[PDB]
């Protein structure tokens, strides 16, 4: 099961030992799994609504809100645990020569278990509060490469 850490992982505020049944109640009540819509036209993946993973940093089932800048890029590294490096490609204008030069920036981003990603895939990241020393973004959508 998802219980792989030394502590017992559970969603805060969801009581799993209630005598009554959660049938016919909203998410997060009656022991039902909690999930939410982040707005901005993004859809909640089915893997997050019907999943069993616990991730307090998940934008859909965690305790993090999306607000600020929405960015897009390509997955550059997917070797960390629930974190990826997103490469953003842009052109920098050189004024004196009236021409452009290719530049890039690596933006660390948290990816919830509901998303499947591989190097080269296109991802959309929404800004959130600092999650680590360098992570300030959360993956919101993944488009497989060649699709």
């Amino acid at each position: 099961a998802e219980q792989t850490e030394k502590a017992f992982l559970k969603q805060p505020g969801v009581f799993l030992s209630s005598k009554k049944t959660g049938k016919g109640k909203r998410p997060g009540k009656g022991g039902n799994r909690y999930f939410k819509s982040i707005g901005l036209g993004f859809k909640t993946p089915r893997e997050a609504t019907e999943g069993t993973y616990i991730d307090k940093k998940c934008p859909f089932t965690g305790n993090v809100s999306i607000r600020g800048r929405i960015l897009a890029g390509t997955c550059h590294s997917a070797k960390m645990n629930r974190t990826i490096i997103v490469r953003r490609n842009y052109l920098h204008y050189v004024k004196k020569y009236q021409r452009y030069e290719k530049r890039h920036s690596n933006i660390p981003a948290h990816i919830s278990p509901c998303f499947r990603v591989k190097e080269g895939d296109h991802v959309t990241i929404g800004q959130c509060r600092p999650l680590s020393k360098t992570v300030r973004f959360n993956v919101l959508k993944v488009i497989p490469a060649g699709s």
Binding site: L40, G41, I70
Partner: protein, 261 residues
């Protein structure tokens, strides 16, 4: 800095105050109050620079310390009190009463009021939410909090406030077709009819306003202030009536004035 700044350098003061740059090294630092420091007019400016009643910083203190000036029906003795948009300033000795309204060039104008019209003001609703004990309340952009508001009142609406009973007399819902005034930005002081509302999720909302002469200009929702329902404002406007003339048109009027005057 290790705390709060208590001084305002004269060149750093808001431009709409129209303070001469060589008048001194400092400008009146607006005190905390209902209006923001960048969107207000301190009483010292009003009494000395606008009305000429006081000739010096010292004389303003004398006038206020005699309790001869009232803002929104209450006596104010603070020289740097932040009087702002729609505030009513009353001077019983001179029998004068003014409302702070932006002229078409974006500067505060002391619009003289009649005695009857000086008994109320317009306020823009900031938000409506439940307070302690589940009691609903609304707060405005002039620092006022009103409990038990009408359930129909929502954010961005305008409420007519009576300065005597201190109660909401009437309110205007924020909707397309009403007459509004711009209270900030490039188009500050312009009056027109709200024609459209463009919403952008997660971003500022843009509102398109059409002038009575057909001129259309845009601005942010935060800079709009509804003045009346339909096309008639509930308050008296200055001579310009929010009509912004081009520099060519303004120059044309000046040339004609010299010929006649």
């Amino acid at each position: 800095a290790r705390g709060l700044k208590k001084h305002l350098k004269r060149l750093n003061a808001p431009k709409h105050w129209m303070l001469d740059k060589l008048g001194g090294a400092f400008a009146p630092k607006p005190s905390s109050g209902p209006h923001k420091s960048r969107e207000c007019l301190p009483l010292v400016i009003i009494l000395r620079n606008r009305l000429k009643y006081a000739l010096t910083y010292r004389e303003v203190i004398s006038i206020l310390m005699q309790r001869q000036v009232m803002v929104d029906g209450k006596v104010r003795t603070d020289k740097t009190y932040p009087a702002g948009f729609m505030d009513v300033v009353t001077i019983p000795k001179t029998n004068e009463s003014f409302r702070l309204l932006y002229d078409t060039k974006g500067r505060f104008r002391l619009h003289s009021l009649r005695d009857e019209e000086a008994k109320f003001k317009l306020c823009k609703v900031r938000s409506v939410q439940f307070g302690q004990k589940g009691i609903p309340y609304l707060n405005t952009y002039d620092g006022r909090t009103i409990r038990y508001p009408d359930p129909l009142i929502k954010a961005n609406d305008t409420i007519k406030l009576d300065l005597d009973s201190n109660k909401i007399v009437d309110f205007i819902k924020f909707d397309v077709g009403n007459v509004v005034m711009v209270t900030g930005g490039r188009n500050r002081g312009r009056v027109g009819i709200l024609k459209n509302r463009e919403k952008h999720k997660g971003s500022f909302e843009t509102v398109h306003i059409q002038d009575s002469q057909g001129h259309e200009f845009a601005t942010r929702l935060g800079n709009v202030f509804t003045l009346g329902k339909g096309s008639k404002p509930w308050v008296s406007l200055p001579k310009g009536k929010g009509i912004k003339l081009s520099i060519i048109e303004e120059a044309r009027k000046r040339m004609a004035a010299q010929s006649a005057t």
